[PDB]
Design a protein around this nucleic acid. Structure first.
Ligand SMILES: Cc1cc2nc3c(=O)[nH]c(=O)nc-3n(C[C@H](O)[C@H](O)[C@H](O)COP(=O)(O)OP(=O)(O)OC[C@H]3O[C@@H](n4cnc5c(N)ncnc54)[C@H](O)[C@@H]3O)c2cc1C
Length: 453
DNA sequence: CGGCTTCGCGCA
DNA sequence: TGCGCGAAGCCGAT
């Protein structure tokens, strides 16, 4: 519907109805940014065709209490910045509190909205909210993929077994869907209290040391749309060249460090891709980084979109389910409870340091996250309980948590999703093994351990 | 049947 | 350090 720099395959109809006479509403959830946002861009273009203004609505659920302050403050601080950015474009933004199923339905009826638009998330709860909203409105309802370069439903119509089968499908579609963004045209027809409330409720559950001092260090990542672009620029200028060689060395700060911003949608992944492609850097680094942000990120969306049990044992490939089941009665060399993992009270100082990097920074290094989750399986009572422990700690403490990438990455580590079978072992069966000595031969483990006590 | 993210391991 | 191989199962291939 309408457009010049607008591929209509990025948009799909969720509900048919008679377009009302009122404003077009972008229900923003996953992509909390004003620039490089196809969902906001398509809402703007729709509003222009109907000769009405575009508005933005955001509903804050009670689901923040299940995580921590660190995610709550990162999102809210960024949202305070976004509120101003939209204001400059004469686009009003309304922030609701409660269940989106009821509030968004009510918001469209009370403000006489003409069209409703939302962005795309493959997670179960978003689909739940959408179905409730559909049953509570009569205006058309659209969905736009503003998070993936190639729309999730276009890249593939099925669960992809591996990156080597998904890669050619995804990259074949890049010349069509990888394109520059148009400017957001302003409207022509023209929070801080929520933040103090949520913190007061989340203070009793704060991660604290033995000195009653909080563990989280908030200065490693400034939230917001402007900071995200700043992190992207310094990556291309200072880190991209060495990425290909040092990306898996957790003693070196060579990752992009973009994942917190990407998760809350404060920066567009397509934007990162556009700028990295144009950079003249190590071709091996660019290929490695573009592979991660394109293939692996968007195959995580694919995984959750086509496996609604994406966070459960049932979603593992049959060979992994058969192997792990056979080893359910094997004696584990160690058994730790969730609380003992959470506090870093295992026998393994490398594991403990990884959990400490997570507790202190809210961003565990990408390489050690594999080691971290595989030892949770190795030292747990059962595969299901390891999945519970890993998902729990990931979503509680990772700034980028509660994300398709986390479920796919944990399912890769514990259940062999998007991996293959390896040598038979006790307890972990044919799931890929990673060892302390394997890490010693790859990077300075003692240095990593010492930085994080 | 070729060859698989991120493996360990032997060996330059 | 980097490379090649081993141990495994299966997908798209033919
Ligand atoms: C056990 C486990 C849990 C994970 N949990 C999360 C999570 O909660 N949130 C999250 O965003 N990522 C998660 N990942 C993926 C990966 O570890 C992080 O995306 C990465 O560490 C973020 O740092 P970065 O942006 O510097 O990564 P970079 O090396 O700079 O990569 C750039 C971007 O590529 C994407 N990417 C990189 N590696 C992967 C991967 N394996 N799968 C999917 N996308 C990837 C991410 O969007 C990332 O931000 C998890 C991986 C594992 C093994």
């Amino acid at each position: 519907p309408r457009g010049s720099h607008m591929n209509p395959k990025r948009i799909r109809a969720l509900k048919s109805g008679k377009q009302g006479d009122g404003p077009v509403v972008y229900w923003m959830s996953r992509d909390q940014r004003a620039e490089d946002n196809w969902a906001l861009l398509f809402s703007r273009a729709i509003a222009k065709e109907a000769n009405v203004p575009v508005v933005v609505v955001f509903c804050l659920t009670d689901e923040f209490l299940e995580a921590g302050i660190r995610q709550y403050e990162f999102m809210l601080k960024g949202l305070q910045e976004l509120e101003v950015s939209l204001s400059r474009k004469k686009i009003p933004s309304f922030f609701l509190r409660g269940d989106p199923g009821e509030k968004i339905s009510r918001f469209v009826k009370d403000y006489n909205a003409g069209t409703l638009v939302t962005d795309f998330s493959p997670l179960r709860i978003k689909n739940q909210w959408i179905e409730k909203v559909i049953s509570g409105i009569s205006i058309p309802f659209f969905e736009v993929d503003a998070h993936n370069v190639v729309p999730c439903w276009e890249a593939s119509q099925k669960h992809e077994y591996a990156a080597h089968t998904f890669r050619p499908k995804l990259y074949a579609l890049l010349p069509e869907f990888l394109e520059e963004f148009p400017e957001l045209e302003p409207n022509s027809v023209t929070l801080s209290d929520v933040l103090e409330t949520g913190v007061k409720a989340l203070l009793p559950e704060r991660a604290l040391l033995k000195n009653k001092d909080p563990l989280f260090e908030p200065w490693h990542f400034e939230p917001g749309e402007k900071a995200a672009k700043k992190v992207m620029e310094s990556f291309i200028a200072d880190r991209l060249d060495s990425y290909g060689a040092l990306r898996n060395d957790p003693t070196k700060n060579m990752l992009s460090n973009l994942s917190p911003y990407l998760h809350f949608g404060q920066i567009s992944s397509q934007r990162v891709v556009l700028e990295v492609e144009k950079a003249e850097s190590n071709p091996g680094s660019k290929k490695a980084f573009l592979d991660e942000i394109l293939i692996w990120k968007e195959i995580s969306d694919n995984f959750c979109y086509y496996n609604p049990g994406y966070d459960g044992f049932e979603s593992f490939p049959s060979w992994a389910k058969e192997s792990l089941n056979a080893h359910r009665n094997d004696v584990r060399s160690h058994i730790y409870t969730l609380e003992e993992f959470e506090a870093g009270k295992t026998h393994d100082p490398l594991w403990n340091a990884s959990q400490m990097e997570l507790l202190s920074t809210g961003k565990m290094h990408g390489y050690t996250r594999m080691y971290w989750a595989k030892k949770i399986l190795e030292w747990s009572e059962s595969p299901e309980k390891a999945l519970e422990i890993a998902i729990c700690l990931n979503d509680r403490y990772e700034l980028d948590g509660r994300d398709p990438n986390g479920y796919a990455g944990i399912a890769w580590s514990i259940g062999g999703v998007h991996d293959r079978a390896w040598g038979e072992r006790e307890v972990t069966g044919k799931i890929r093994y990673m060892s302390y000595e394997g890490c010693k031969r790859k990077f300075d483990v003692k240095l990593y351990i010492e930085k994080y006590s």
